[PDB]
Amino acid sequence: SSVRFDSVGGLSNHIAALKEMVVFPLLYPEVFEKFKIQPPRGCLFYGPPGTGKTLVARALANECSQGDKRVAFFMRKGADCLSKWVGESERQLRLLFDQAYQMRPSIIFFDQIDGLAPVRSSRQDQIHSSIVSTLLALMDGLDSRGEIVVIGATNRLDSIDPALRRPGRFDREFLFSLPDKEARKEILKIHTRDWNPKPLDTFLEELAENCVGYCGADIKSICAEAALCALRRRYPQIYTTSEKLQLDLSSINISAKDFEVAMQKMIPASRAVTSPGQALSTVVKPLLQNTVDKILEALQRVFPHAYQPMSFRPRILIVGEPGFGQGSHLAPAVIHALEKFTVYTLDIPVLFGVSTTSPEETCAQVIREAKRTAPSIVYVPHIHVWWEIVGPTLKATFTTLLQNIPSFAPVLLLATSDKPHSALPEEVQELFIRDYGEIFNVQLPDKEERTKFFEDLILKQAAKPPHERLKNLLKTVVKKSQNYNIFQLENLYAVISQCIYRHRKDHDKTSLIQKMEQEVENFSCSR
Amino acid sequence: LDSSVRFDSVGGLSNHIAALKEMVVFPLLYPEVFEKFKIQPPRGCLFYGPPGTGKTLVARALANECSQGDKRVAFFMRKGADCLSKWVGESERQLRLLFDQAYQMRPSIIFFDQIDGLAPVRSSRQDQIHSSIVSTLLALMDGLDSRGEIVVIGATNRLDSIDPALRRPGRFDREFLFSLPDKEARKEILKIHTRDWNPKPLDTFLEELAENCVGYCGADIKSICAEAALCALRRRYPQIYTTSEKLQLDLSSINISAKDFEVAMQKMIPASQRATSPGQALSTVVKPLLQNTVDKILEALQRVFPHAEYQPMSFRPRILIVGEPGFGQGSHLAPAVIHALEKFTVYTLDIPVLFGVSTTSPEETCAQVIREAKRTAPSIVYVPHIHVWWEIVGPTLKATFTTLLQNIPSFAPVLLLATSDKPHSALPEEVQELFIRDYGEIFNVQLPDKEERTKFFEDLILKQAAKPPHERLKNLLKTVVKKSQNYNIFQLENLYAVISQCIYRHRKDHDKTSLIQKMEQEVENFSCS
Ligand SMILES: Nc1ncnc2c1ncn2[C@@H]1O[C@H](COP(=O)(O)OP(=O)(O)OP(=O)(O)O)[C@@H](O)[C@H]1O
C-alpha cells in the first residue's frame, strides 16, 4: 500500500509509454486540442506467468490516487459480473459504466479477462455471446463514453474474441517477458534495500548469473528462504519445544552458504516442462570450454547478433561421430550461454508426447510464436533420426513452412546430427550449404585439457586430512587415455573416485595406493 | 453526440448512402409520385461486415442530419440487449411499448444496434426466452394491422446467426455489404480526419502514404495520426518524461513532419492481420530487381483476365507460372501479384491451412472455401507449389477438387492461380490437361539482366560506401557485377547480406582503404559457387 513506481525493475519503456495515457492529458491539456487528438485510451497486458503484471496496476493506483490531481479507481474480478437473474447479469455492466462516468475521470481495471470474453461461437450458451455483445457495444457505440481508461490482463492472448482487438476498444498490447541478467540485479537491489549488514554489490553481481530461468516471484521467495535457513543454522533446537524461548537477534547474519543451500534446495518456475538449455557441469568444465567458445565464434561469424546488424537465413549444424557427446553435452550449453533469446524446443517427445492434438498444428504454432518474438531460436536435435520417424505429411508441412519466413528476420535453425553429411539423405543436404559455412566438425580434445580433467581429483582430492608415485600414476593414465570417447572418460573418473570413496575411513595411505594401481591396469575400457 | 457530422465527413460509401435517403426523405419530400402507383417503398435495412468500417458512424451521421432539418422525424436506439426484463410478462411488453411510442410520433426510425445478440436463429436445444422474443418481434414487425411508415434498421457484426425468417422482403429486405476501403476511400478518409491542420499536408504526400497503408480498416488510420502526434512530441522535448512536474512549452516547434509517420507506422499492425494474410509487398531491397517482371506478369494476366483494368466478358480464367527451383516464383512473385492486385477478396488454399486446423475434415474446408469464394465473385484462389502439393493429397481429395471445380458457371469470373518448379511436361497428365498452353495459360521466368543487378547493388556499394558519421569503388562494382552472371536470387541476396556485414563491422573506423582492402579480400574470397 506504499509502492510508487519504485519497486518495479527494468520496465522502462512500458512505464514511460504508460504514463502518457493518464497523466499527460491532465497535465498538459493545452496540446491535444491543438490537433484534435483524443489519444488512445486502452491497453492490454499479457505474458508468461510469474512476470509481475498486477504490480504495475498497484503502481498506477497508488501513485495517481495521492497527489495534485485525484483520479478514481475501480477494480473487477474475472467473472464477477454474472448473477442469477437474467436481465441484470448485463445490467451491472451498464450501471458500472454510468457510475464511473459520473465521477469522471476514473479508471476501470479488468483482471483476468480471458474467462470473460471468449471467442463468439454457436457451440456454447448464448449468454456468453450476450455479455460479449453488450460489452463490445458499450465501449464504443453511439455515445463516445469520454474520459475512461480500460485495462485488461491475461496469460493466453489468442483466446480473446477477434472483434475486441481493434483500436478504440483495446488499443495497445504489451510484452511482459522473463527478466534478463540486468533486471535480475535490479530486483535484488530492490528487495535488499532495507538490510543493516548491506551486502556488497559485487557479491550480488556474481549472484545474478547463476539465477537463470528465474522470474520475479522466485527471486522474492529465495530472498525469504535464505534468511530462514540462516536462522535454521543458528538455533536448531527450536524445533524440539512446545513453548516459547528467548532468542537473541544479533547472531543470525546472512552468509554465502545460506544462499547456496537455498539455491540448491529450490527450483525455478519454468517446472512443468524442461528447458533444453542447461549449464555444463563443473565436473566436465575443464574439457569443453574451448570447444564451446569456438562454436560461439563461428556463430558470431554467421549470426552477428551474438544502424542494425543484418543477416540472411541464419542456419548452422553440429555433427560428429558417435560418442563425442555432441548431442547431450555441447548444444544445451550453447543455448544456455545464449540466453536473452527465447528458445523453442521441437523434437520427438514434445510432438508425439502431446495427444488430443495434431502434430502439424503445434508445428505451425511454434513457428508462429517464434516469428512473433523475433529474434529467437528454433531447436531440433538428432536430425538423422528425426527425419525417419515422421510421415510424409509432416515432412511436406515443415519443409514448406519455413520458406515463407521473411528472409531478413533473425531466426536461427540449429540441429545436431551424428552420421557425417555425406551419408545424410538427400533433400536435407540441400538445406545446408557448407561451402557457405553451415557445417561445423567436432574433434577430440588434446592432452592439456585431458590432464586438467584428472589432476584435481588425483592430486588435491587424492590427499586430504581425513606420495610421489601419484605423479607416475597420473602420467600413465594420461598416456593410456589418449583415444577414448567422452563416455569412457567420465566412466574412468567415476571408477577412480569410487575407490577414494571406499577408502574413506582408513587413516593411513599406501593401502589405497595399491588399489588405485590395480584399478589402473585391471580396469580397461573396451574402445 | 456531436453536430459536426453532416454526411460531409464520410468518404468511400457513396452507393450505400445514396440508396439510403431514397427511403426516408423521398416519401416526405415528394409525396405525390409514390402514390401515383401506390407503391409503399421499402422500409427496412440491415448492415453487416468486418470489424470497423463506419457502420455505427453512418447511423450517427444520419440521426444528426435528420433531426436538425425541415422534418423532425423522431429517433431511438436500443443496445444489443437493452429490452430484457426480469418479469416474465414484461420482457416482451417492453418491445410493444417501444413500437407504440414510435407510432404516436410517426414518422420514426428505430435503430437496433448489435442485433446479433438479440435475434439468434431459433433452436430447441437452448432456452425458451430467446425463441419467444424472436417470435414476439416478428409477429409485430409486419403482419395484420400493418406497421405504418416507420423504418427498421439493424447493424450487426457477424451475419449467419440471424433467424432466416427475419430475412424476408418486408422485415429485412435490403442487406448492405460493408467492405475494407480501397485506395481512393483511404485517401479520402485521410483527408477527412486531418481537415483542420495548421500546415496543410501536400496531396502527393497523401498519395505516397496511402500507397503503403494496406489492410488498414477505417479506424486504424484514425489511430495513426494520434500515434504520429505523440511520436513528434516525444522526439521534440525528450526531457519531459522524467519530470513529474509542470513545465513550460513553446507551442511552435511542435510541427509534425515526415519520418514521423514511418516511425509511427513501425509500432503498429492492422486490425485484420492480427489473427495473417497470404499477401506481402516486395521488400525495400528486392523491388528494383523484380519490378519489371511483376509488371510483365500483370500485363499478361490482363490479356487473359479482362477483370484487371457493355461489359468485359470472360470464360474461366486460369494461369500457371513456371520457373526453375531457386528462381523465387513462389516466395517473391505470387505474393507480389496478389498484393498489387488488391480490391479482390482472396482465399489461399495451401498445406498449413489444409492440415493445420483440427476438428474439420480437409475436404470440408476445401468445399467451404470454394463455396464462399463463388458466392462472392470476383475473387482468387491461390494454390502455390503444385508440383509438391499434388503427390501429397490423397486420391479422394484430388477427385473432390477436380469435380468441384467444374460446377462453377462457365462465365463466372473466378480465377485460379498456381505455380510449379518442374517444367510442364514432367507434370502428371491430370493437371497437365487442366492447362491448355496454346491458349496462353503458361508464363515463363527469366533471370534479371545486367542493368537490374547494377541498379540492385549500386545503392549500397557506391552511395553508401562513404557515409561519414573513391576511384576503386567502380572497379569493385564492375568486378562483382560480372562475377555474378549465373546466380539465382538466393545467391544474390546472400551476397548483398555479406557485403553489408563487412560494411557495418567497421562502423567505427574513420579511415578508408583499411576496409576497402577488406572488401577486396572478401570479394575475391567469396567463392560461393
Ligand atoms: N520486475 C519486478 N520487480 C519486482 N517484483 C516483481 C517484478 N516482477 C514480478 N515481481 C513480483 O511478482 C509479483 C507478481 O505480480 P503480478 O500479480 O502483477 O504478476 P502476474 O504476471 O499477473 O502474475 P500471475 O502469473 O500471477 O498472473 C509482484 O507482486 C512482485 O512480488
Ligand SMILES: Nc1ncnc2c1ncn2[C@@H]1O[C@H](COP(=O)(O)OP(=O)(O)OP(=O)(O)O)[C@@H](O)[C@H]1O
Ligand atoms: N469512413 C470513415 N470516416 C471516418 N471515420 C470512420 C470511417 N470508417 C470508420 N470510421 C471510424 O471507425 C469507427 C466506425 O466503426 P463503428 O462504430 O461503425 O463500429 P465497428 O467498429 O465497425 O463495429 P464492431 O465492434 O462490430 O467491429 C468510428 O470510430 C469511426 O470514427
